[PDB]
């Protein structure tokens, strides 16, 4: 169960980074002063957002850009909680055994 | 199992911070305006990136610098998921027992 939930989350995270990159540019163009407006740097912004690093070099200023950002965040965080929970499950079993 | 995976991750993380520091400078010099260009501050940037703190004082502006940054991030995050999963495994056993 756990590994499949984790693997799926990883696949789902990759999809969210790419879709999030596309949707962030769509949301932010048309807002004066917005910088999250070209796709290559938007993919970079989605990665530093999903990992929760959040340098501050780029960020959304619109309502829809910010909603996209929160989905990226939660997708990243969730994937990591799942990988962590999966590692714990693995270890717990190998330790029962040892 | 768990402690060795954790210990190894810690050793591997130290290697990634040093190699990441070297590779980030290599990637960023030659890009006008880049600031992640000397080794001492690049090691500092790798540490605040791996812990996901990400102050924003320094960051990569090139494609390869950013790929290096994502490896540092994932190495940091993974090490911590492993330590956490290791602590859970330890506790779970001592509690079966208690």
């Amino acid at each position, epitope marked *: 169960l756990h590994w499949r939930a984790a693997g799926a989350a990883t696949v789902l995270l990759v999809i969210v980074l790419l879709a999030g990159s*596309y949707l962030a*540019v*769509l949301a*932010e*163009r*048309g*807002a*004066p*002063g*917005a*910088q999250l*407006i*070209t*796709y*290559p740097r938007a993919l970079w912004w989605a990665c530093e957002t999903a990992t929760t690093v959040x340098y501050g070099d780029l960020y959304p200023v619109t309502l829809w850009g910010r909603l996209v950002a929160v989905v990226v965040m939660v997708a990243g965080i969730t994937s990591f909680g799942l990988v962590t929970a999966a590692l714990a499950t693995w270890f717990v079993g190998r330790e029962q055994e040892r | 199992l768990h402690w060795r995976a954790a210990g190894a991750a810690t050793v591997l993380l130290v290697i990634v911070l040093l190699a990441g520091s070297y590779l980030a400078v290599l990637a960023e010099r030659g*890009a*006008p*305006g880049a600031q992640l260009i000397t080794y001492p501050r690049a090691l500092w940037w790798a540490c605040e990136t791996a812990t996901t703190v990400x102050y924003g004082d320094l960051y990569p*502006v090139t494609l390869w610098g950013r790929l290096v940054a994502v490896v540092v991030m994932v190495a940091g995050i993974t090490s911590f998921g492993l330590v956490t999963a290791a602590l859970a495994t330890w506790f779970v056993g001592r509690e079966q027992e208690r």
Partner: antibody
Amino acid sequence: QVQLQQPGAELVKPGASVKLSCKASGYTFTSDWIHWVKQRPGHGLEWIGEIIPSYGRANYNEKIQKKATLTADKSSSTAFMQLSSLTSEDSAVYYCARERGDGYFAVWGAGTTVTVSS
Amino acid sequence: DILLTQSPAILSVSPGERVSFSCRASQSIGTDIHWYQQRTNGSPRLLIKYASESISGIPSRFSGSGSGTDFTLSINSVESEDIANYYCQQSNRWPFTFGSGTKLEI
């Protein structure tokens, strides 16, 4: 082959409207945006607006009076700019240009010379 | 919105000489500047992207430099075919904007 094809000219009476076209060929991606640029004789390049065909959303220059409405047809790979209620101030060459979502205009159409006159 | 100032508006050089066009942004835009050449009655043509990157098909004669607020387009050894108007354009913040253009005279 020519990546963006535009008609050479359009004559428009003051107050009437006209719909300019820009037929695209070559590689097409979901990240493409088509932009329109206005250039009066002897003057510079003025950005009018952009549209992303894959989604149909358009943005416009807020600094100027809005004379344009952008649309795009996916099946005919054609982008359109509806100019309405024109005056002589609207007489100029209007170019369409393609941007691959990375900020620069890789290719430009030949431009349509629009003359507003009776 | 970002203002791009190109000055002087007219640059006169002697054949074969190195010439440089200036583009100054009203605020720092990294290296998000692109340059176009527009010959008389022609449409604009991209020459350099992201301040210094080459475009295939463009003579090696052209190059770009700068970051922040000050950018330069240089032509090593100008020749007649370089006679044209040159424009810079930024893509750092929305909306994209253009400089007012510099004409090269030989």
